[PDB]
Design a protein around this ligand. Sequence first.
Ligand SMILES: CCCCCCCCCCCC
Lengths: 48, 1019, 144, 96, 48, 48
Amino acid sequence: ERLSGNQAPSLYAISLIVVFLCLAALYESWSIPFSVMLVVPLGVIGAL
Amino acid sequence: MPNFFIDRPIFAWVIAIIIMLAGGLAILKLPVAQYPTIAPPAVTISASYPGADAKTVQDTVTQVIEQNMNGIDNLMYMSSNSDSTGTVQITLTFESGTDADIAQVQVQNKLQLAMPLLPQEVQQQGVSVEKSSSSFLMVVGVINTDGTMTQEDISDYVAANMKDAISRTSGVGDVQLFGSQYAMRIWMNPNELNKFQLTPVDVITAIKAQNAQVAAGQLGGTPPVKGQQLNASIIAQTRLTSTEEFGKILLKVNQDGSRVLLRDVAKIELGGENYDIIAEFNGQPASGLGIKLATGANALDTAAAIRAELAKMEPFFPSGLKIVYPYDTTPFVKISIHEVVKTLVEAIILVFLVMYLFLQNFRATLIPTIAVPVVLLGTFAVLAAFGFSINTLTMFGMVLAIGLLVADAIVVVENVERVMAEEGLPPKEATRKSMGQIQGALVGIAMVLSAVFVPMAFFGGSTGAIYRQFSITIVSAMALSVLVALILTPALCATMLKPIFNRMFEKSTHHYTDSVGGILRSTGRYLVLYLIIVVGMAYLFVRLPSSFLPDEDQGVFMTMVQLPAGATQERTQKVLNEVTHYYLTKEKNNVESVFAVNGFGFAGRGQNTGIAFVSLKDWADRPGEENKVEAITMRATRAFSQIKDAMVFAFNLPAIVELGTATGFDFELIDQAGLGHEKLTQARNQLLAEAAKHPDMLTSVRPNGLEDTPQFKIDIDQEKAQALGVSINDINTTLGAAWGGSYVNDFIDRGRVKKVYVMSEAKYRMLPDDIGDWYVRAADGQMVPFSAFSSSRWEYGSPRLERYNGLPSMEILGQAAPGKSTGEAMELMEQLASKLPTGVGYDWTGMSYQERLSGNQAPSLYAISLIVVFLCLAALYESWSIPFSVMLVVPLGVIGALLAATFRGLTNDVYFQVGLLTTIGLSAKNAILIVEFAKDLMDKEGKGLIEATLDAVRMRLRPILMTSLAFILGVMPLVISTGAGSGAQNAVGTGVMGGMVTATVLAIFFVPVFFVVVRRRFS
Amino acid sequence: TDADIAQVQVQNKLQLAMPLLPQEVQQQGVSVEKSSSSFLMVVGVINTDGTMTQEDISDYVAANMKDAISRTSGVGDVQLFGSQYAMRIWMNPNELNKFQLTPVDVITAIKAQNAQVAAGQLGGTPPVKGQQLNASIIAQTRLT
Amino acid sequence: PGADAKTVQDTVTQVIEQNMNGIDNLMYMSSNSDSTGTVQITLTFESGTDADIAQVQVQNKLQLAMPLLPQEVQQQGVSVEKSSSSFLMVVGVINT
Amino acid sequence: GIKLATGANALDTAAAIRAELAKMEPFFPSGLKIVYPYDTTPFVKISI
Amino acid sequence: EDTPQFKIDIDQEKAQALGVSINDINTTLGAAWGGSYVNDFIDRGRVK
Ligand SMILES: CCCCCCCCCCCC
C-alpha cells in the first residue's frame, strides 16, 4: 500500500509525457498539445 | 523515409526525445562493473578432513565424491586437488551460457546423496559447494594500533560484529574472511594422561557426554488430565558457555577418592579454529574481508556503501582497532571509465571545431552536436535491452564507435551545404536533393557494416565473450546512426539552416584533381604499387606478437614467496618480514601498504608458502614511467634474487584475474591404465626432459604441482598389538586426535555457536622423539608405549595430488617460443606425448581447451563477412563486378595499423582487432560514397568514366577530410596518455589512428583507380 | 514441465526422508535422475581373443568406461550389464566354528585392519618457536 | 527439538539469516522461533520473480549453513519450500 | 545401457557417446573390442 | 507473550557420586516427559 501510493505521482507524470509527445507527433504543432494538456485538470477534478 | 520529413520536423523531434529519454533512464538503471563475466561458469566443491595427508584425503573423500558427479548437465571438464593440509578442491567447469545457479544446485544434490559415503569427520566439517568467481571487489583489512588483540581476537571480532552487516547493504555478494573465529581449545598434556592412565579417547568421550542438548517436553503436556491449569515448557541442561566450566569435566575417579578433571590433565584456551594462516599488515597483526559483487549491482555504488557503513562502525570499535584497505581496485575502475567518458565528450567538441573550420556557419555545427549524443544515449538504451553493463569493454566500444557517428553526421550535413553552394536552392529544396544522393548508399552503409561486426559475436568460449561486448555496442551505434541520418538529421537541415579566414583560398585552390587526373592516365604504374602494400600488409601481420589484453597499473601488485620442502611457518614468516622490510625502506616513495599472508599462495596452502598484497600510492602522487608496476616489479625481482632458501617473485595482476595467457598452453597428463603415481612421475619427467631439447619451439615448460617430500611413516605391528591387547581403534584414535586435532562438539559463546577441538599441546608433538611420550591403555589398565608395538621410518610421498576427469593427472604448464604461434606449440606437445610409456594419455584444459574446439572460426566467420559485404554492395550498385572498387580498400587501412603497432611496440590483442574493423569500417564507408556519386554521374548525366570519377572525387574530398581530421584528433590523447588506465587506450587508440591516416591519405587515390580499372575490364 | 526444476523439487523432499532410511540403504547410494524409460543404446564390449572372462570385462568397463560416459551431457543414467570387482571374502562356517569365530569377528577385524587413518603432522600449527621440520605422519592405509 | 526459543534464536536462526544475503530480488525476511524448537524463515521476493529460480538460490546457500548449525538439525532436515500463507479451502470430515 | 536424459537430443547424445568411446579405445588391453548390439539413433538419422 | 518456564537443573557431580550415567538420565527425562519416537510399525499396510 505504501508502494502503490508512493509510485503513483510518477505514474501520472510519465503518463502525461507520453500523451504529450504522441500528440505532438501526430498534430505537428507544439501548441496543439498545450491546448489539451490544459484540459486534464478539468477532468481530474470531477474524478475526485 | 527521410523525405517523409518534408513537413514533419516535430515528429523527428519527438522520437529524438524518446531516444534521449530511453537512454536517460537506462543509464540510471544499468550495472557498472569493470569487466563482464568472461570465464565459463565453474563450481568448486571444498571438503576438509583435518589431520590427513594427500592420500587419505584422496582415497576417502576425493574419489568417493567424483564417482558420483554424473547426470549433471552442460559439464565441460572436472579437476580436483588433494593437499597434505587436508583439503579437497573439486572444480567443475561448465559450458558458456550455463545457468550458474542451476548447475550449482545439481552439483550439490549429487553431493548431498554422497554424504553418507564420506568419513564422519568430513561430514562434521561440512562440505561446501560454491560458485568460483574469484574477483575481490575490495579487501577490508582490520588492524589494531598498539596491540592487545592478537590474530584471533581481531578475526573473531570481525566475524561476530562486522561480517554480518557487510553481508547486508545491498549489492554485496558473498564475503570471505582472512582468518577464523574463536573455538574452545583443549591442549592435552600426555604426561598426566600417562600419569592417570588415561587416553585422548577418554577425553573425547567425556566432552561429547557433558556438553549436549536435551529435549524434555512440557508440564501439563498433551494429552493432559482433566482440570489441568498449567503449561510450562521445561528446560534441561544446556551447552556450556565459558572456559571455566570445561575444566571441571569429570574424566574418572581414582579408587582413593580423587577427582581427575579435565584441567588437571589439559589446559584450556579460547583460540582459533585453525592456525594455518597468519596475516599481517605492515608487520602488525591483521584480519581481512574479501568481498564479491552481486548481479545487477554497480561496482562504484557498493564500494561507496561498504565504506559508508564502515564509517558507521568506527565509533563502536574497541579503543585501538581500526580499518585499512589493502586491496581496492575501485579507484582504478572509477578513473579508467571516467577517462573514456572524457574522450566521448571531447569528441563532440572536436566535431564542433572542425566543422566551424571547414564550414563557416554556426547553425550547421549545431546539427552534429545534436545527432551524435542522441545515438550515444540510444546505445545505452539498447544495452539495457540486451542486458549488459557499463564496463571497460563496452566503453571502448563507444570510443571506437565515435568514428562512425562522426562520419554519419559530417556526410550529408556537408552535402546539404554543397548543393546550396553550386545552385541557389532554398534549404528545404536542397535537403531533398541531398536525399537523392545520400539515401541509398547510406542504408548500404548500415548493412555492409553489420556484416563486419555481427559475425564477431559468434566467437565462442571465453574469448568471444570479449568480442561480443564490442560487437553489440558497435552495431548499436551503427544502426541508430543510420536511423539518425534519415530521421532527425535531414529535419535539422530543412529547418534552422538559413540560406545563402584566408583558408578557403588555400583549400579550394587544391591541385588534387590535377594529381588524380594524372594518376588515371597512368593506372598501370600504381596498380603494382598497390601490390607492394598487399604484400607489405601480409608480412607485418605475420611478424607480430599475439596477445589478449594489455598490462595495466592496477595500483596493487603481488609477491609470492615459496620456501623449499619441509619448511615451517616461522621460516616463511622470516622471509615475509624481509619483503615487508624491503617495501618500507627501499621502495618508500611508491607503496602505501603491504598485506602479508603467511600460509596461502597460488593453489597450495602449506606452511612453506606465502603471499603479499602490495598496494601502491595514488597515481597522482606517483608520477614517472620509472614508478609503475612494469618497473617496480622488475626492480624488486632483481632485489629478491639473492635471498636464499626461497623463491620470491613479485609480479603484476592480469587483466581478468580468472583467465589464462596468450602464447601459452595448459596441458594434462592422464594415466588411463591404472599405472600409479611413480609411473606417472617417470612419464612426467620423460616429457619435460624431451620438451627441453626444443628451445626454438617450447619455452618455460614446467610442472604445475609439487614434487615428492619425505614423510614420517609409522607402522603398527598387528600381533604385537594383540599380544599386548591394545585395540587399533584406540591406537589410531590416540595418534589422530593428539597429533592432528579432533573436533568434538560445539558450545555457545556470546550467543554464537562455536567449536571445541582436542589436540596435543604444541611442545609434545614437534619431533619424531615425541612419539615416546604417548601411551595407550590395554584392556586391563596398562599404559603401553608406541615403541612396544610399532616401528617407524621415513619415506617419500606426494604433498599434492591432482586428478582430471576422475583419473589421476599431472598438469604441465608451458608456452611457445618467442616468434611462434600457440597451435604450432600445441601440435608438438601431442607429438611428444605419443612417445610416452603405454597407458599414459593427455588432454587440453584451461584456455587450451577453448582453442582446440574453436579452430576454424576466425577465417570461417570472416568468410561469411566477405560474401555478405559483396552481396550488399552488388545490391547497392547495378552490377556484379561493382563491389570490387570498394572491397579492395581493405588492405589500405590495415597497412597503417600494422605500421603504427610496430613503430611503438604494440601487439594484436583484442583492442587492436576491434580497431582494425573500425578502420576497415571507415575506409569502406568513404569508398562507397565516392563510387556512388561517380556511378550516378554516369547514369543521370553523360559523364564519360573519367569525367565521372574526377567530378565525384572532388566533391567527396571535402567530407572525407572532415571525418578523418575529427577522428584522428579524437583518439589522439589516447595515444599520448600515460599511467591511469592508459594500457588499454594506448592499444585501441594507436592501431586506429595510424591505420586511418593511411586510409585518408592514400585511400583517396586508389579508390578512383579501382573504380575505373574494374569497369574497363567489365564494360 | 522444466525437468531441471522438477528434479530439484524431488530431492528437496527426499533429503527430508533420507535420514529416516536404513543405514545399509544410504551407504549403497540413493540416486535421483532425469531419464528415459528405455535405453537409448547398448554399448557392448567383447574380448576377441579369450584372455578375459565375463567378469573380467565387466570390471574394465566399470572402472574405466562407466564414469566418463555418465558425465557425457545428455546421458540420463547408465545401466551396467555386469559389475565391477569387489574384495570378496567367502566365509566358511566350519573354520569359523573351529576357531570360535563369528561373521561379526570377521567384519570387526576388517574394519580395524583395513583403515585409512588421518595421523597429523610433525610440527603442525601452532608450532613451538624455533621449529625447523614439517612432515605428514603416515598411519595405516587401505589394503590393495 | 527441545530447545529454548533464545537457544534456537542464536544457534539456528541467525546462522541462516547472515547467509541469506546476496539472493536476487529481496523485499524482506521475517523469521520466528518458538519454544518447541521450530523455526520458519519466510523469504518474500519481489513481484515478477520466477518462484523457482528464487527457490534454488535460497537453497544453494542454505546448504553452506549446515556446517554452522547444531548437528541435531541435520537429522530432522532443514526444509526449503515455495510457500503460501492463506488457505484455498478447508475440507472437513465428520461422522453422522 | 544408456538412458537418455529428459529434453536431450538423441542424435547429439549418441554422437557425443562415440566421442568418449573413441578416446578409450587407444588404452584398451589387447583383444578387447567395442560392439554396437542395440542403438535406436541410426533410425533417426537414416530415415530423415 | 512471555510464559513462565520450568528450569529443571540436573547437577553434574551429585549424579556422578551416586553412580548414574547422564545419558540414561537424559533419555529418561526426555522419553517420559516429552515422548520419544522409537521406530516404526505397520497398521493396515502403512508404516506408522
Ligand atoms: C535498434 C538497433 C538494435 C541493434 C541491435 C544490435 C544487434 C547486434 C547483434 C549481433 C549478433 C548477436
